[PDB]
Amino acid sequence: TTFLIKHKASGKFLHPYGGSSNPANNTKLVLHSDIHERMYFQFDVVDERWGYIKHVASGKIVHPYGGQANPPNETNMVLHQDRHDRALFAMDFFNDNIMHKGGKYIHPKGGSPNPPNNTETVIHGDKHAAMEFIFVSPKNKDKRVLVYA
Amino acid sequence: TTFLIKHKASGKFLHPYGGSSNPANNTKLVLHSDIHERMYFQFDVVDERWGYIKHVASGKIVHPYGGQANPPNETNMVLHQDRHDRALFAMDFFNDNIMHKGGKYIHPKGGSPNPPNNTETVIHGDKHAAMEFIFVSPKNKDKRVLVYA
Numbered sequence: 001t002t003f004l005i006k007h008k009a010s011g012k013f014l015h016p017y018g019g020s021s022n023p024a025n026n027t028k029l030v031l032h033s034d035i036h037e038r039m040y041f042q043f044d045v046v047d048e049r050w051g052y053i054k055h056v057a058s059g060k061i062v063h064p065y066g067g068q069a070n071p072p073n074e075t076n077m078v079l080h081q082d083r084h085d086r087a088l089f090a091m092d093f094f095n096d097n098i099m100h101k102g103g104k105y106i107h108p109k110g111g112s113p114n115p116p117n118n119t120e121t122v123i124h125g126d127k128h129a130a131m132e133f134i135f136v137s138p139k140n141k142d143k144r145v146l147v148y149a
Numbered sequence: 150t151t152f153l154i155k156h157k158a159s160g161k162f163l164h165p166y167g168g169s170s171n172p173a174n175n176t177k178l179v180l181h182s183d184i185h186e187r188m189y190f191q192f193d194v195v196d197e198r199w200g201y202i203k204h205v206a207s208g209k210i211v212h213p214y215g216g217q218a219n220p221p222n223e224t225n226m227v228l229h230q231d232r233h234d235r236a237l238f239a240m241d242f243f244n245d246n247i248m249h250k251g252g253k254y255i256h257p258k259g260g261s262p263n264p265p266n267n268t269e270t271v272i273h274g275d276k277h278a279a280m281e282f283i284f285v286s287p288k289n290k291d292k293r294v295l296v297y298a
């Protein structure tokens with residue numbers, strides 16, 4: 001299933017910085033209001049809840065920058081071609097968050113519920129309304145879709 | 150994906166009472182320690198998180214007894230052939246519970262962490278450790294499997 005990753009508090013979406021159809025490794029992932037094919041994602045299941053968040057246009061996947069098993073708070077989110085266990089995430093569509101295998105979540109940098117376009121995303125352990133994400137249809141940004149298959 | 154519905158606190162599983170391959174309509178669902186093909190389930194997705202919990206051997210699904218949209222506390226869980234919105238559940242594999250469309254959960258009747266074999270299951274709104282369920286492989290009762298597949 002193809003979906004948009006929507007920041008629940010702002011309604012902005014996860015994008016590669018610059019919107020490239022083939023972002024370079026380590027391109028940052030930001031929040032931006034626009035919708036287009038280069039901000040479509042899919043989820044590739046690896047092990048029950050755990051899988052890779054794949055940028056459809058490039059085939060690169062979401063990583064914490066540096067690929068640590070336990071990235072510290074404020075580690076930037078990026079795209080990278082590599083597949084390994086430090087690029088594993090769970091798409092928690094019940095609590096509305098995205099959890100890295102090490103236990104921390106994807107956040108807007110600085111914690112704003114209404115961050116401006118091109119706000120970077122980072123790893124952080126905290127849970128609050130401004131780290132919530134929902135996973136929605138490219139054809140209807142208010143309709144949740146099932147990311148697991 | 151075929152799975153066992155495992156009561157987390159006790160390790161017992163959801164069964165039709167009597168363990169038939171073809172339980173009659175309105176047969177109660179109970180907890181029981183045995184594993185066999187007549188306690189296998191599948192989940193048929195209807196709308197994103199919402200779907201039918203299907204008894205594989207019979208093709209009947211889990212209902213609140215009487216088919217309420219908002220079943221009261223202590224309403225019995227049963228199997229029934231019918232498919233409708235009052236037999237929709239969500240299999241919350243992050244919080245480890247099974248939520249009915251009306252917002253309440255599947256519980257062992259009385260809320261014991263170690264209910265005896267053949268304890269009835271019911272709807273109840275409370276959340277606690279004795280209403281948690283995990284969804285496991287028929288080949289490995291300790292291995293969680295993805296039910297949304």
Ligand SMILES: N[C@@H]1[C@@H](O)[C@@H](O)[C@@H](CO)O[C@@H]1O
Pocket residue numbers: 015016017018019020030032034035036039118
């Ligand atoms: N035109 C795009 C815009 O839609 C968005 O993807 C943005 C993300 O940084 O990059 C470009 O400016």
Ligand SMILES: N[C@@H]1[C@@H](O)[C@@H](O)[C@@H](CO)O[C@@H]1O
Pocket residue numbers: 026063064065066067068078080082084086
């Ligand atoms: N070794 C890793 C690489 O695989 C990737 O996770 C990358 C993501 O930034 O970080 C490191 O360079």
Ligand SMILES: N[C@@H]1[C@@H](O)[C@@H](O)[C@@H](CO)O[C@@H]1O
Pocket residue numbers: 074107108109110111112122123124126127128131
């Ligand atoms: N308090 C918030 C924290 O929860 C997290 O959102 C962080 C993300 O950078 O920003 C702030 O420190």
Ligand SMILES: N[C@@H]1[C@@H](O)[C@@H](O)[C@@H](CO)O[C@@H]1O
Pocket residue numbers: 164165166167168169179181183185188267
């Ligand atoms: N033999 C079965 C047992 O395995 C279990 O399914 C039980 C559930 O009530 O019914 C019968 O006793």
Ligand SMILES: N[C@@H]1[C@@H](O)[C@@H](O)[C@@H](CO)O[C@@H]1O
Pocket residue numbers: 175212213214215216217227229231233235236
């Ligand atoms: N008419 C309903 C039937 O569809 C089913 O939900 C059943 C479940 O017990 O309750 C009622 O008979």
Ligand SMILES: N[C@@H]1[C@@H](O)[C@@H](O)[C@@H](CO)O[C@@H]1O
Pocket residue numbers: 223256257258259260261271273275277279280
């Ligand atoms: N106190 C418990 C309640 O939380 C619920 O588990 C209920 C289920 O029947 O049993 C007991 O009343």
